[PDB]
Each structure stands twice: as structure tokens, then as C-alpha cells.
Amino acid sequence: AMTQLTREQVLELFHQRSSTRYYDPAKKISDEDFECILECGRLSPSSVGSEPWKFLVIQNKTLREKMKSFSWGMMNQLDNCSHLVVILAKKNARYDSPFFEDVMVRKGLNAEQQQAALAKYKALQEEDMKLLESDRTLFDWCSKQTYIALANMLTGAAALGIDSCPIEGFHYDKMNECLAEEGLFDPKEYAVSVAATFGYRSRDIAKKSRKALDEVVRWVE
Amino acid sequence: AMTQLTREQVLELFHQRSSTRYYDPAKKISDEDFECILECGRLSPSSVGSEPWKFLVIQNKTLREKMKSFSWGMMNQLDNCSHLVVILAKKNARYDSPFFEDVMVRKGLNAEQQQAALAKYKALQEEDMKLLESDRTLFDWCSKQTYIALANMLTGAAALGIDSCPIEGFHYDKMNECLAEEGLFDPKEYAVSVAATFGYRSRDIAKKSRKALDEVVRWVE
Ligand SMILES: Cc1cc2nc3c(=O)[nH]c(=O)nc-3n(C[C@H](O)[C@H](O)[C@H](O)COP(=O)(O)O)c2cc1C
Numbered sequence: 001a002m003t004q005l006t007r008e009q010v011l012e013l014f015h016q017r018s019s020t021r022y023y024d025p026a027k028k029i030s031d032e033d034f035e036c037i038l039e040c041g042r043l044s045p046s047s048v049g050s051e052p053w054k055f056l057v058i059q060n061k062t063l064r065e066k067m068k069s070f071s072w073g074m075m076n077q078l079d080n081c082s083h084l085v086v087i088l089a090k091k092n093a094r095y096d097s098p099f100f101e102d103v104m105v106r107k108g109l110n111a112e113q114q115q116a117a118l119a120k121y122k123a124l125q126e127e128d129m130k131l132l133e134s135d136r137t138l139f140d141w142c143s144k145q146t147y148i149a150l151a152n153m154l155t156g157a158a159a160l161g162i163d164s165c166p167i168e169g170f171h172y173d174k175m176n177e178c179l180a181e182e183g184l185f186d187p188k189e190y191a192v193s194v195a196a197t198f199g200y201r202s203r204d205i206a207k208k209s210r211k212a213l214d215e216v217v218r219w220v221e
Numbered sequence: 222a223m224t225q226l227t228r229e230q231v232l233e234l235f236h237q238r239s240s241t242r243y244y245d246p247a248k249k250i251s252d253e254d255f256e257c258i259l260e261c262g263r264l265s266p267s268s269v270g271s272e273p274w275k276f277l278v279i280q281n282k283t284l285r286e287k288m289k290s291f292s293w294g295m296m297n298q299l300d301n302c303s304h305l306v307v308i309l310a311k312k313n314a315r316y317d318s319p320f321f322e323d324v325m326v327r328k329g330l331n332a333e334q335q336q337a338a339l340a341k342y343k344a345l346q347e348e349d350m351k352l353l354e355s356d357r358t359l360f361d362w363c364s365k366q367t368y369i370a371l372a373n374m375l376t377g378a379a380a381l382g383i384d385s386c387p388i389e390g391f392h393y394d395k396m397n398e399c400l401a402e403e404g405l406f407d408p409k410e411y412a413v414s415v416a417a418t419f420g421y422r423s424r425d426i427a428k429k430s431r432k433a434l435d436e437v438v439r440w441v442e
Pocket residue numbers: 017018019020021072073074165166167168169170194206208209264265266267268269270271369
């Protein structure tokens with residue numbers, strides 16, 4: 001049968017998922033649990049099946065130490081967290097690129113289906129979403145897809161009883177340069193999108209503070 | 222106690238979550254289940270607690286019909302899905318805006334804490350992430366946060382046994398103009414980010430096709 005939760009269980013999960021700034025350095029996530037977290041990212045949906053992401057798992061302590069200088073949003077977490085993921089997004093993911101040829105093959109499209117798909121992707125990028133305005137608009141489209149993978153990794157971790165924190169608080173140019181200089185990706189192909197820490201909290205879970213549902217929802221009947 | 226799943230259950234959930242293009246028009250999501258889905262969006266994390274989203278629930282059939290002309294990615298789904306959400310993202314969410322004053326209050330910051338937070342947000346936007354390059358770069362930052370809310374709504378729906386589909390396949394300028402002309406938001410304040418349909422599938426769940434874990438993960442020990 002299928003895995004299914006009650007509404008109460010779903011809400012519990014989303015109140016357990018919180019941004020963890022204080023991790024217990026004595027508790028490490030198992031290799032099995034961490035592989036499951038990564039699989040939540042891998043299995044995430046993405047526009048046109050583009051999967052425009054790479055997951056860098058930064059366990060090396062010397063590299064984490066170097067990041068402290070320019071990563072104010074995770075300074076405390078770098079020494080204490082079990083695992084750190086830096087998510088990259090694909091650069092220059094144009095409809096007519098070799099990257100997109102591979103997207104289509106993972107679907108198994110023949111020449112005619114590829115022709116129709118290419119026309120759809122061109123319309124999506126050029127006219128519907130206007131992504132071809134600049135390199136940054138096209139990069140940011142791929143980056144949006146990586147935030148889906150991020151969200152699913154945080155939620156999957158929480159479902160396994162593992163704490164996490166999403167991270168934007170770092171100097172992106174310095175982070176890109178540092179990780180490229182370490183040989184972790186080709187900077188012509190990918191650039192840093194967002195990061196996340198994972199581990200076990202050393203403090204209580206902070207209560208949710210959010211705008212009310214009536215503030216954020218408008219119903220059009 | 223806390224809600225917790227096994228690795229096998231988490232993976233099942235992420236294989237059950239699939240992009241549903243074919244919905245059974247006879248099956249409607251209950252008001253209670255749909256409120257739970259919306260709460261998964263509301264409870265989502267967001268950079269600096271910005272929550273830069275609105276959720277428009279488009280149930281009106283005449284409005285759905287109008288969208289068909291310019292929404293190729295959800296044409297089939299518009300007539301058959303139970304619920305449709307169009308997610309908006311905040312425009313011009315500058316660190317020094319009234320929008321950001323409210324972000325800080327939901328945290329309860331006094332004048333000195335606000336001063337420190339404003340300095341952090343200014344550094345994040347101006348220098349770390351370089352969001353102030355253009356209106357679009359700043360909008361796309363908020364839009365990225367809305368993709369977290371999207372992902373969590375899809376996953377929460379799947380956990381409740383409800384099918385969904387994320388949607389970018391529409392003309393954004395036409396969609397913005399149409400929904401603003403209906404009075405659903407102030408177009409000076411928000412613009413369309415991404416959409417999603419929800420309902421019960423009329424076909425089998427399609428098997429996952431993804432790049433292998435070894436393709437997308439790089440481990441830095
Ligand atoms: C993309 C993103 C980036 C964030 N960056 C940071 C960060 O650098 N450091 C940090 O401590 N929190 C960071 N946060 C956490 C937010 O401040 C947090 O989600 C928000 O205040 C709501 O709290 P909650 O996640 O505990 O519900 C980030 C959140 C998101 C989604």
C-alpha cells in the first residue's frame with residue numbers, strides 16, 4: 001500500500017521542520033539516512049525534467065573552516081553540523097544546448113518528439129517566462145528548481161528525525177570562487193545556488209511565527 | 222511524540238509524488254485536506270523569514286476557462302483538477318521597505334535589533350547575493366522562496382494521498398495581467414511566480430526518471 005499520513009501528522013512534520021542554528025557536535029547522521037536525504041533532492045520535480053542541480057557534500061573540516069570568513073549565515077553551524085550541502089544550479093541552460101539534449105533523452109524522445117519539445121522549450125524560455133533576457137535570468141530559473149530540491153531535503157530530513165537549516169547567508173562570489181578553486185565543479189557549467197546544513201539540534205525547536213492563513217490565501221470562487 | 226518515518230516510507234512518498242496531467246473530474250479534495258495543503262505552504266521556511274508569497278486559489282470555472290488560451294502546460298488539467306493555486310511573489314522586497322519592517326516585527330525586534338537586522342539584510346541583498354542589480358533579480362529572489370512553498374504543498378498533498386502538478390507552462394505577462402484585472406492582487410506589490418494543480422489522478426503514477434545519484438552528488442571529504 002501507499003505511504004499516507006493524517007492531516008495532524010503532516011502538520012506535526014511541518015512544525016518539527018525548523019531552522020536549526022545550534023547543532024550537537026557529538027551526533028552524526030548515518031550514511032544511510034544521509035543518502036536518503038540526498039535521494040529526496042534527486043527525486044524532486046523540476047521544470048521540464050531539467051534536474052538542473054548538483055549537490056556538493058562538504059565534510060572536509062579545513063574547507064568548512066575556510067568558509068567561515070564569508071558565511072555569516074552559517075558560522076555557528078559549520079563547526080557543529082553533521083553534514084553540509086552546497087547546491088549548484090546549471091548555467092546557460094538554453095533550450096538549444098547540449099544540456100537540454102540530455103534532458104530529452106532521459107524521457108526517450110525520438111527526433112520528431114524532440115522537435116516538438118524544442119519548440120515548447122523555446123516558447124517557454126523566450127516568450128512565456130522571458131528567461132533569455134540575460135545570463136542571470138536564465139541561471140535564476142534553474143536556481144528556482146534547486147529550491148524545490150532544497151525544500152524536499154529539509155522535509156525528508158525532518159521526516160527521518162533529522163534537523164536542518166537552509167542557508168543563503170554567504171558571499172556568493174567568494175563561495176563560487178572557493179569551491180571552483182577546489183575543483184568541485186566546472187564554473188563554466190554550474191554556479192552556487194543555495195546551501196543547507198543537517199544534524200541534530202542542541203536546543204529546543206523554535207515555535208513557528210508566520211503570517212496568518214487569511215493574510216496569505218485569497219480564494220477565487 | 223514526534224512524527225517520524227522510515228527511510229523506506231520517505232522514499233515511497235517521493236515516488237508517489239509525481240506530476241499529474243490527468244485528473245478524475247468526479248473527485249474533489251475536501252476543504253479540510255486543502256486547508257492542510259495550504260498550511261504546508263504557509264509553514265514553509267523562507268530567507269530571513271520573509272514569507273514573500275500569496276496563494277491564489279482559482280476555483281472559478283470561467284476564470285479557469287480563460288486561462289486555457291495562454292496556459293499550454295495545464296490545459297488538460299484546468300477542466301479536471303480539483304484545486305488550482307497560483308503563487309505570487311513579492312515585488313521590490315528591498316531591505317529598507319515597509320515589507321521588511323513587517324518581516325522584523327513577526328520576529329519582535331526592538332529598535333537596536335532592527336538596526337542590526339537591517340545591516341544584515343542590506344549586506345545580503347547588496348553585496349552577498351547582489352540582488353539590487355535590477356527589479357527582476359530582486360523579484361526572482363522572492364520567487365525562489367515561493368518554490369519552497371510549492372515543493373512543500375506538493376509533498377504535503379502527496380502525504381495526504383492527493384495528486385498534484387507544478388506548473389510553469391503559461392504566458393507570465395498574460396497571466397499577471399489577467400489575474401490583476403480580476404482584482405486578485407495589487408500588481409505594484411506582487412507578481413505571478415508559479416502555479417500548481419491538485420486532485421486525484423485518472424491514470425497510473427508514472428515511474429521516476431532521474432539522473433543517477435552518482436551523477437548529481439559530489440562528496441568532499
Ligand atoms: C533559502 C533560505 C535561506 C536562509 N538562509 C539562512 C541563513 O543563512 N542562516 C540562517 O540561520 N537561517 C537562514 N534561513 C532560515 C530562515 O531564517 C527561516 O526559515 C525563517 O526565519 C523561518 O524559521 P523556521 O525555518 O524555523 O520556520 C534561510 C531560509 C531559507 C528558506
